[PDB]
Amino acid sequence: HQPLIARDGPHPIEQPTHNYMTKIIDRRALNAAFSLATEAIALLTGEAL
Amino acid sequence: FETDIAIPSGISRPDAAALQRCEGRVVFLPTIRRQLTLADVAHESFVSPDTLGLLLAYRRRFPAVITRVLPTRIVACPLDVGLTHAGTVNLRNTSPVDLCNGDPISLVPPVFEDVRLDSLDLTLRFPVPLPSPLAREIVARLVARG
Amino acid sequence: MLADGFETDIAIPSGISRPDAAALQRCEGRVVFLPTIRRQLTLADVAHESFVSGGVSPDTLGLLLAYRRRFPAVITRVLPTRIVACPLDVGLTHAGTVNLRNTSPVDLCNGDPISLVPPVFEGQATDVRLDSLDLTLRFPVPLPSPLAREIVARLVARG
Amino acid sequence: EDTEADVPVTYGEMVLNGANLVTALVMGKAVRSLDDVGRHLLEMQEEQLDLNRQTLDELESAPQTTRVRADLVSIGEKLVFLEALEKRIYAATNVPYP
Amino acid sequence: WLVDLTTATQPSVAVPRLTHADTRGRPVDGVLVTTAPIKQRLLQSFLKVEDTEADVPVTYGEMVLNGANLVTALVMRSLDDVGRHLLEMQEEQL
Amino acid sequence: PTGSLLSTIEVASHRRLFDFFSRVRSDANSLY
């Protein structure tokens, strides 16, 4: 809203107003790599063949 | 709607009597406003201008007719914004011309013949409410004299 | 009311895009030439489409001569479905005060009589064009009177 | 082939699922006093169900169809209302019949 | 000059649910971000540490679905029961 | 038909209730 101060005498200017503001989302992304060698996956999995 | 022209203090006894006489008389204000000093009304605000300088000034300014006069302030209503709301405002002749019913009345600067307040150090010139078909005559006679 | 004010209703059509609908709301205090004192009119009557003569869209001097054959009105509020105006020849409002807006590059002062002039100046020919309706709205320029007697004299003496 | 038809009387209504707007004044800045804007969302979104549970239960219970006199002519494989409309509507009005 | 940093910016629009505050609960209206040789210089002589431990929100906010398109169908039970299926899905959105 | 497939006819509209109570200055692309 646009705020109001009242004035005396004859009424020169206003009718009460609104403002509809719209703003555009800017999208981004974040990356983080992570590696595991085959020497460790055989420990995380379980039994062998 | 009614404006208030406040008299500044320091009023002598004949000076309150002179402002008491201008009951139904035309006053030019600069801008429509509630608070208004008397010095913007008076002839000091017009600087002395000639008849052409008054005719220019009587179109940039906004005329107002005095209502009742209080001992502290002059209550006047303007002829543009405050008269369409109210019904009827009395107006006094300063003219040698008798007004008839149904005339359209313009105003003329005081060419023919000055309420001066001595304590306040100002003069007051007031226009002459004569009808408009004479106003295009009386100006046109006097220009034809010169 | 009947004497003090007179509200017209310039109707807005159905199909209007929002790039066009958001341009009319910036046209709040303007000057609009009604041909009549009807209470219901359309934008095809207000716009420059109805302004054309038989086939000939006239220039800035003939633009004068079809002003004074019409009725100047001032927009007072732009609603989504209609535009509300007040013709100046009838009466202003109950209060008798309608807000205009400068399109001039020139300041105004107190007590100056306003005459309106076409968009004659350079850097001034701003026509609000509505693309979905093919409508231009050539808004005139409120100038002080001692300018408006110069410009008419500059245009008449040029011909 | 027929003279009297069965015709519905009620108009049709809607299920409103509208984008809602919240304006509420809050006196103070506390946690429980700012969540009342959030409660006002689910207070008003609940009331849209209270309207929409009525408008289905009215249409189930309303008097649906009445009996109307109108000409019915079969052409080919289907029934058709045959109708002339310059005596009911456009009679004694200055309108051209379209 | 530090007042000219803080009085050149017009204050924002949104009021958060949870506010950064003191131990007293007095809210905060901004953040200066400096470098370490500037921050440790401003703290000794120029400025005053009025509080040391702040109150900081922990939970991120979430969303409430405010209105979405009503698209259903049923394979045919009267014809009116498609409407009573529209109310089944709005109740699931509350 | 008992093997048919109905659907709700949807009316999507941009109502503007608050242009009539007060002045608005919105953008050109406000799906408000």
From TrEMBL, chain C:
GO cellular component, as recorded = viral capsid
The molecular function GO annotations come to:
structural molecule activity
Q: Which keywords does this Swiss-Prot/TrEMBL entry list?
A: Capsid protein, Host nucleus, Virion
Q: What is the name listed in the Swiss-Prot or TrEMBL entry for this protein?
A: Capsid triplex subunit 2
Organism whose genome encodes this protein: Human herpesvirus 1 (HHV-1)
Q: Which residues of the full protein are shown?
A: 1 to 159 of 318
TrEMBL record, chain D:
Superkingdom of origin organism = Viruses
Q: What is this protein called?
A: Major capsid protein
Q: What is the source species?
A: Human herpesvirus 1 (strain 17)
Give the gene symbol.
UL19
Automatic annotation (TrEMBL), chain F:
* Superkingdom, natural source: Viruses
What's the protein here called? Major capsid protein
Q: What is the originating organism of this protein?
A: Human herpesvirus 1 (strain 17) (HHV-1)
